[PDB]
Amino acid sequence: GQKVNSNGLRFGINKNWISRWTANSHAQTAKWLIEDEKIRNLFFVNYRNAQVSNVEIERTQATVDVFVYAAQPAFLIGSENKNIQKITKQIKQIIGRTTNLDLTINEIGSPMLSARIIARDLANAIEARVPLRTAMRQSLIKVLKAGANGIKVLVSGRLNGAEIARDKMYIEGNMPLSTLRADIDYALEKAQTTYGVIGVKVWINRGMIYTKGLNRTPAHILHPQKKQPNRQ
RNA sequence: GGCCGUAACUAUAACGGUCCUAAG
RNA sequence: UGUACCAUUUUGAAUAAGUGACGACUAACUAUGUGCCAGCAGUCGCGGUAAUACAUAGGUCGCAAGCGUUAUCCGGAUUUAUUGGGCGUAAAGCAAGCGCAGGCGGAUUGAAAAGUCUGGUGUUAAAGGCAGCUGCUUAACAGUUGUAUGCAUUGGAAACUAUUAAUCUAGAGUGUGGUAGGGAGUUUUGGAAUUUCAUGUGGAGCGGUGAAAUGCGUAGAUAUAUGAAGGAACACCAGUGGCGAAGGCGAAAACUUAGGCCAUUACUGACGCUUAGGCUUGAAAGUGUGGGGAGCAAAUAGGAUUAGAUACCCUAGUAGUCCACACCGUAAACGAUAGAUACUAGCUGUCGGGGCGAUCCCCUCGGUAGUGAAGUUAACACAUUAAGUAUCUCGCCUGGGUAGUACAUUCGCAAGAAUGAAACUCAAACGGAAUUGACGGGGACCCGCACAAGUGGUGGAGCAUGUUGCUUAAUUCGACGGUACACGAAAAACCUUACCUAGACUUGACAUCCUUGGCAAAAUUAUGGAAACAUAAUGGAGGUUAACCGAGUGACAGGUGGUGCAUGGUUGUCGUCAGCUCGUGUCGUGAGAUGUUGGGUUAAGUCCCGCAACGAGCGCAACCCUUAUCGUUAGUUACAUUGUCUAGCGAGACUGCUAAUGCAAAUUGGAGGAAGGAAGGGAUGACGUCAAAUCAUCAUGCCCCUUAUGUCUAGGGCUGCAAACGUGCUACAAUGGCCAAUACAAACAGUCGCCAGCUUGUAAAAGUGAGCAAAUCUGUAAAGUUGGUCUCAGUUCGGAUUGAGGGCUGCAAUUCGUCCUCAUGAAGUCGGAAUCACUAGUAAUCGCGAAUCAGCUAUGUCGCGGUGAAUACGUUCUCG
RNA sequence: GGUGUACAUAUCUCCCUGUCACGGAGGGGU
RNA sequence: AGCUCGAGCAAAUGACUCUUAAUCAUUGGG
RNA sequence: CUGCUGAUAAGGUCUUCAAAA
Ligand SMILES: [Mg+2]
Ligand SMILES: [Mg+2]
Ligand SMILES: [Mg+2]
Ligand SMILES: [Mg+2]
Ligand SMILES: [Mg+2]
Ligand SMILES: [Mg+2]
Ligand SMILES: [Mg+2]
Ligand SMILES: [Mg+2]
Ligand SMILES: [Mg+2]
Ligand SMILES: [Mg+2]
Ligand SMILES: [Mg+2]
Ligand SMILES: [Mg+2]
Ligand SMILES: [Mg+2]
Ligand SMILES: [Mg+2]
Ligand SMILES: [Mg+2]
Ligand SMILES: [Mg+2]
Ligand SMILES: [Mg+2]
Ligand SMILES: [Mg+2]
Ligand SMILES: [Mg+2]
Ligand SMILES: [Mg+2]
Ligand SMILES: [Mg+2]
Ligand SMILES: [Mg+2]
Ligand SMILES: [Mg+2]
Ligand SMILES: [Mg+2]
Ligand SMILES: [Mg+2]
Ligand SMILES: [Mg+2]
Ligand SMILES: [Mg+2]
Ligand SMILES: [Mg+2]
Ligand SMILES: [Mg+2]
Ligand SMILES: [Mg+2]
Ligand SMILES: [Mg+2]
Ligand SMILES: [Mg+2]
Ligand SMILES: [Mg+2]
Ligand SMILES: [Mg+2]
Ligand SMILES: [Mg+2]
Ligand SMILES: [Mg+2]
Ligand SMILES: [Mg+2]
Ligand SMILES: [Mg+2]
Ligand SMILES: [Mg+2]
Ligand SMILES: [Mg+2]
Ligand SMILES: [Mg+2]
Ligand SMILES: [Mg+2]
Ligand SMILES: [Mg+2]
Ligand SMILES: [Mg+2]
Ligand SMILES: [Mg+2]
Ligand SMILES: [Mg+2]
Ligand SMILES: [Mg+2]
Ligand SMILES: [Mg+2]
Ligand SMILES: [Mg+2]
Ligand SMILES: [Mg+2]
Ligand SMILES: [Mg+2]
Ligand SMILES: [Mg+2]
Ligand SMILES: [Mg+2]
Ligand SMILES: [Mg+2]
Ligand SMILES: [Mg+2]
Ligand SMILES: [Mg+2]
Ligand SMILES: [Mg+2]
Predict the structure, then answer these.
(1) Alpha-carbon distances of A167 from A78, A178, A199, rounded to whole Å
(2) What Å value separates CA A183 and C1' C56?
(3) CB A154 within 8 A of CB A169
(4) DSSP classification of residue A159
(5) Which of strand F's nucleotides are less than 7 A from any protein C-beta?
(6) Are residues A102 and A25 in the same domain?
(7) Does residue A166 approach strand F to less than 7 Å at its CB?
(8) Number of domains in chain A
(9) Domain membership flag for residue A157
(10) Is residue A143 part of a domain?
(11) Residues A126 and A45 reside in one and the same domain
């Protein structure tokens, strides 16, 4: 049957919030809730070739701070910091010139075990007419070789352009979805194929969190150094 | 021994309802 | 015949390519159109609005001066099986026996040489086939040489078959000796029991069924005792049995009579096996003539059940069942397996003869059974009594339906029996065996407010809301058993709004890309106006164009338009039920099986033992939140009757200790404990089913519209109304109506708000006006307690409906808001068949708060507290 | 009476069932 | 009226469904 | 412990493929 969202079930217990701010009134709460959505959607739908794993937003009465974790931040940086100013102006237009922007790019360590970029690669391969069995097999084998626990990939839709929708699942390793202690990262993406839309959902297991607390700690960004700038 | 209705072209009624008789 | 052919003879790519196919067999794919229509097809099969199968185009493939379609013949087809098949369950062993002709047939000797083998000779016309070569430019073709098969005659071979002449006993019979039998026919005899009749006792029913009714009975039934008559069948013995060729044979006896088993120093000396045709027997039903008739019972009559009952049940009841004599000649006549002969492990019973001599048991020869390896089989299974290794003979089979039908023939008194097709039609068949599920008015076990025990309702009345139907210009669309119907919609007067009428607009109300300037858009005031929009005004923030304000400009924007059966995402349901699978291994030709089943224990595929399985994943459980006790931290805005209360951390409960029994998991009881054996509640919902729901949250393939299906505005509509259903509220009342005083909550919410107090008003509310950005101020707690009154009535119940006067929100309250006051006072007195929820702070009942919201008959939804029950014996029934 | 003679059949509404039939409750028509 | 006596069939249009049948309405047709 | 217990319009998806990593 239907299952609750893996991220939503674990939020507020073993996962911190992607946007951390306290608005003044109900009128401002909607504007701030929509502007952050616009910024995140921008960073995800465009500038996709940089493998942006996640973007967090942190706002005060008047100051906006953006933390963009990316696997290949060279594409965000551009040639001698060219596209950086373009995305800065895009964000400033999105929120407002009256505020102070503190954009900060962060190179994410051990990218392979991140469901967002795994799903994005899956969707890109699907859209590029790559055969599905080979695509999922190579993604699963590279994810496992990255040194993580089980990964479950569900790819549904008009499969290979067929007129009857199917679904194909590959679980390889233990994926306890009912357990709350487990560190399960879940992402979902849409491959826009010439025959319609394909939905790819990737669950990845990254061990068990044996330290009680609302995170306040990096999650698989720490194995190598996670120090990139563009801030003040 | 009667009467009435009834089958996907028409037609008919395998079938159904009912009155009476000792039995039709 | 100026022909084949030849030549440096002039001209010149000039004079020349189609057909089938492209989903698989079978080499070769895309678009357009159609939309179970038009059409294709050798077979499977395509076409229901996304067709590589249809029609067209493009592309590609197979051949080519040919290519396809049609007809016929052969092969593939071992599919008439001599080479070269079968008959237990798929088509096929006659019902069984006695058997002439035919086929086959023990051992040895001799002769001949009919089959068999071999040499010589004659012939088997030429052409054709195969091999070699020559000639046409090579080939096709022509020519040339070689090249078999059968018959006859003659000459040899003698192993095998046939013929003839004989010998032998081992096959088969005969005799003597042992011997078991429900083998058969004819004639007598016997006892239980039913029925009828006769005679006694007796007094209201008997009979029959799921329940009854026809029926029998005070004319004395059923019952009981004695006797008589007649008919049919022969309890117990009676079997993990006997006899016969099969059908079949079971009370006792006599007579006549058939076959079989064992041992044979005896005799005949191959006399044997099978058997077309022929003859004999052949369950039961049926026929003809004559007898007989107790019981039972086709046909028939009535009573029931039933929608109907010509059936199942019951009461009667003729033929028949019985005997003699003549026919019929069919059966699931079955071991679904023809007979004969030789060989091939074993183990356990039982029956008969023989060897020993208490039984019992041992050996030998046979009959009848079970288990079982080799071997066979598609598998089930057979397996010394073969379906195994082989031979001989007979019968039979050749896809399903037509059809065991029709015609002809033979038999019969008759019903009918034997024999037995085709025309036509299908691609398979009420084909065989086995596997996984589903299902069973099939079993075993186990669960759930499922049944049971209770409480309170629903269906009856009025009202609110939703839906079906109908009406209308529109009554926008969706949801339709459980899993739709107070659902999307957590707010339809305008807006919402997607609908109708009407007034207006066109790169557009909104956006990007481009050539281009910014020295605007708003808002408001005038006039025209239903408002959209037009003509004039202040010409505007700013920052030189950043955003936006424009001109030009074609790509286009736009669509709540269709398709949820093209999809992503999200969700309902089985179901918080305990299941769903995988890797390796093993078993099986294969689908598949094992693990996952078996025994215990749980809510659990939870765990422990067992086990050709060993492990693993998702699901289960725990980790998460909250309630129940306590410690510590902190004491304001809580408390301030001093330790409540609020919120961080922590302790505590772990089958931890004990007794019982179990191998162990574990189950039950006790102690202490606030809490005991998932302590209560929540979040958490596996693979998948229903092509389940949503294109109208959003996104999106494809189709459709593009001065209109896109856009703005005003009015109407979503609120209609003979009706029907669902979900709720209010009641029909003294456990109550009205009035007065009055005590005790939790949670939540609040600066276009919560609104304390005061004044005004019968009241909704109005004015003034503090307090509160909140543990501080505000949002009246009601049921409950006491007192007064009503006194069982359509009422001081019940409030619907209706008229009038007012309050608030809002441009605007008529369609269509709600509140207050006054007045009127429908139905309804406990609700038919039938149904719903609930296992403790639960049902019932009483209030309070919040979300969407200017306002709202939300009586709806989500939450909070006050009072606070009854019952669970049990799984026989009911749903899952 | 709509059909055979107030009755039955038939008609309508509600139960029943996945649905229909059967079955059960109620109403009307000379 | 196309057929049987404005009615009922026949035909068409829609609703309905994956598409039909059936059903539901509407409807021209003397 | 044997009441009664009848029926369900037609055609249909759904495996694309292992060449291989
Ligand atoms: Mg063709
Ligand atoms: Mg074609
Ligand atoms: Mg042949
Ligand atoms: Mg043939
Ligand atoms: Mg054969
Ligand atoms: Mg047979
Ligand atoms: Mg036989
Ligand atoms: Mg036979
Ligand atoms: Mg014989
Ligand atoms: Mg003979
Ligand atoms: Mg010749
Ligand atoms: Mg020649
Ligand atoms: Mg007697
Ligand atoms: Mg007889
Ligand atoms: Mg009768
Ligand atoms: Mg019956
Ligand atoms: Mg009788
Ligand atoms: Mg007779
Ligand atoms: Mg026969
Ligand atoms: Mg027999
Ligand atoms: Mg056996
Ligand atoms: Mg035939
Ligand atoms: Mg025959
Ligand atoms: Mg047949
Ligand atoms: Mg069932
Ligand atoms: Mg049952
Ligand atoms: Mg009950
Ligand atoms: Mg109530
Ligand atoms: Mg009611
Ligand atoms: Mg729609
Ligand atoms: Mg509607
Ligand atoms: Mg629908
Ligand atoms: Mg409106
Ligand atoms: Mg200016
Ligand atoms: Mg300028
Ligand atoms: Mg669906
Ligand atoms: Mg199982
Ligand atoms: Mg086993
Ligand atoms: Mg086991
Ligand atoms: Mg759980
Ligand atoms: Mg559907
Ligand atoms: Mg539904
Ligand atoms: Mg659309
Ligand atoms: Mg309007
Ligand atoms: Mg409505
Ligand atoms: Mg009182
Ligand atoms: Mg105070
Ligand atoms: Mg007050
Ligand atoms: Mg009182
Ligand atoms: Mg009354
Ligand atoms: Mg009153
Ligand atoms: Mg009004
Ligand atoms: Mg009363
Ligand atoms: Mg319970
Ligand atoms: Mg449709
Ligand atoms: Mg009954
Ligand atoms: Mg029928």
Answers:
(1) 39, 22, 9
(2) 61
(3) yes
(4) G
(5) 13-21
(6) yes
(7) yes
(8) 2
(9) yes
(10) yes
(11) no
